[model samples]
Structures are given as C-alpha cells and as structure tokens.
Target: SMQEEDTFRELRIFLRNVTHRLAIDKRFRVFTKPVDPDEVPDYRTVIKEPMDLSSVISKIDLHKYLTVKDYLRDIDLICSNALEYNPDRDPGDRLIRHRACALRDTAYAIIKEELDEDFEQLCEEIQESR
Candidate 1:
C-alpha cells in the first residue's frame, strides 16, 4: 500500500497548490462551491485524447524540485501509449488504471531503492510545506 499512500500524498499536495492558486485569482471567491465528484473528468478519457506531451513538458517549470515533474512526465507517456493501444474503450477503463498502477509501483520501487534518503527528505519537505 505504500504506492497508494504516496499517490494520495502527492495528489493532496497537488490539490493544495491548485486551491492556493485559485485563491489568488481575483475573479474567484475565497469560499467557492465544493467540487462535485461526479463532475470530475475521467483520467482515462483525458489520456485517451490526443495529448502533446512535449508541449506539456515545455509548460512546466522543471527547475521546481518539489514538483513531481519527472513522475508526471512518465505518467503522460504511459497513459498516452495505453490510450493509443486501447482506443475503443471507455476512458475509465479498469485495464488502463491497472497499467497506470503498475507503472507507478515500479517507479516508486526504483525510487525507493535508489534514493531512500532523498525520498524521505522530500516527504518531510512536502509535509512541512503543507
């Protein structure tokens, strides 16, 4: 379950950043309505669509060490390829999710083995930042 925990933590931090950014937008109210779960976009669907990974990479600031830029880049590649091969399926397909989960687990395992201390430090930093 370590991978799931890590994914949850990462998503929480990402959402926090999104909330903070939205707060700073003058047009958006501080107490905006809560997001409806049903209204959320399906990841598979988004991934299935034609995606310009290079364009996405170009837009991100790779210099931000705290950001999961590399992991996201990997996700982009995996999901894009998955979608390409399974074009006829729904975006919320279980197979695609399984593929993503496997990729994430493999990446996390390698990261844990190669950068144990650095990974711990990053987790601590993320906790402090939140």
Candidate 2:
C-alpha cells in the first residue's frame, strides 16, 4: 500500500504543477477549430465559448473503456494539436503549454474516474484538512 500511496502523492504534486501552468499560460486561451469541414463559423462565434473544466471534461468520455495508457495518449494528442494551432506563440512555449494541459487533463480524469471525486471536491477536502 505504501507504493500506491507514494504514487498518489506524486500524482497530486504533478497535477498541481500542471494546473498552475494552465492558469498561467496564455496560449491555451484560444478556441478549438470546428471539426466539421462544412461549418465555417466566424471567429466571434468560436471565441464566445468559455473555457472551464466541465467543458473540457465534456469533450472526453472516460466511460468509453480505454486503457490507462491510451487515455493518457489521447490527452497528449489533444495538447499536441492545440499547440500546433497556437500560431501566436513560439514552438517551445506551445510545447510546454501542451504538456501542461495534457498532464492536467490526465490528472483530472484520474481523480474523477479512478478516485471517484471531482477535482474541486478533492481540493476542498485538502484545504479543509489543512
């Protein structure tokens, strides 16, 4: 159980760092391009949507029965694609932001699905304990 506990502790630290990076990074502020080739939505329409955990989580279905590694890979792919779309930022900065986003997304899913608690609830519990 010690190994599992240590793993959870390390994951928590990683998740914290990822969340901090996402909050501080400006590159992820942009909107995702529409997946449908026929839909030529205006930039205003694209930019109107707000970014939040629920929105991001909604994009993914954790119940789809993906392997843990596969799930992580998909998160990485999302970040990589986002970085590729961020034309305003340098490649290195985009890459860093991408990694941060991937880590944050993966960690959030891990807590939500594996631990059976939302991120905010976990954070609240942590704060309450301290």
Candidate 3:
C-alpha cells in the first residue's frame, strides 16, 4: 500500500507543479488557432481574414493553424532531463531522480490527455525528442 500511495502522492505533487508552471511560463503565454496553449498567438492578423498563425517550434510565419501536440514539448524537454539523474537506491539519488521521474510522468499524462487515447508510443516520442 505504501508504494501505491507513494506513487499517487508523488504523482499529485508532480501534476500540481505542471499547472503552476503553465500558469507563469512566458513561452506559454499565448495561443493561436491551435490547441497548443504554449504558443504565441497571431496578434496582427488576429481580427483579419484567414486568421493565420506562426510556426510553433521557431515562431516562424506559417499562415494557418497548428497542432496541440507540441504545446507542451518545451515542458517535456524540461521534465525528460530527469533521465540523466541518479537512480533511487541512494537517499540523495532517490530524491533527485525519483522526483524527476515522478514529475516527468505528468507531462506524458498531459500528452495522453491531448490525444484522448492510450498513446504510449507518441508520449515516448515526445520525451525522446529532447
């Protein structure tokens, strides 16, 4: 019961951090014709026809919409760095890597939430991208 409880406790805190990060991160302050809430929305042609949007990865000009998939790619990169930390055998290592892994899973959950399916492969792809 402890490990199960422990996993959920860690999971809860991890997701809370996700909500907090999304609330304040500058890179995520805008949204265009895309579900990617992390992107910068179209400001100039916002009220005009076509209602174009810029590229998400580089902010390049791309006339049109985009995908919600890459919205948290930045966050994924942040969380995925957990893989580099030490394993959970040592107290210090457990604190560092354990928390990191717990935190990283939430990003995957967000991704799965996006696709609204059992998207393990895609989630791993996002994690592996960075």
Q: For residues 4-68, could you state the per-residue lDDT of candidate 1 as single tens digits?
A: 45744564455344334433444333113322337644534544433322333333333222445
Among all windows of 10 consecutive residues in model 1, the one with the lowest summed lDDT is 28-37
lDDT at position 64, candidate 2: 26
Model 3 accuracy (lDDT, Cα): 0.39
Residue-pair clashes per candidate: 0, 0, 0
Error of 2 at 46 (Å): 14
Where is model 3 more than 4 Å wrong at Cα?
Answer: 1-18, 21-66, 85-89, 114-130
> What tens-digit string does per-residue lDDT give for candidate 3 at 6-66?
4334433443444555435443333212323246354223322221122232231231112
For model 3 the TM-score comes to 0.32
Q: What lDDT does model 1 reach?
A: 0.45
lDDT per residue (tens digit) for residues 84-123 in model 2: 4454677766665765475556555654655433544543
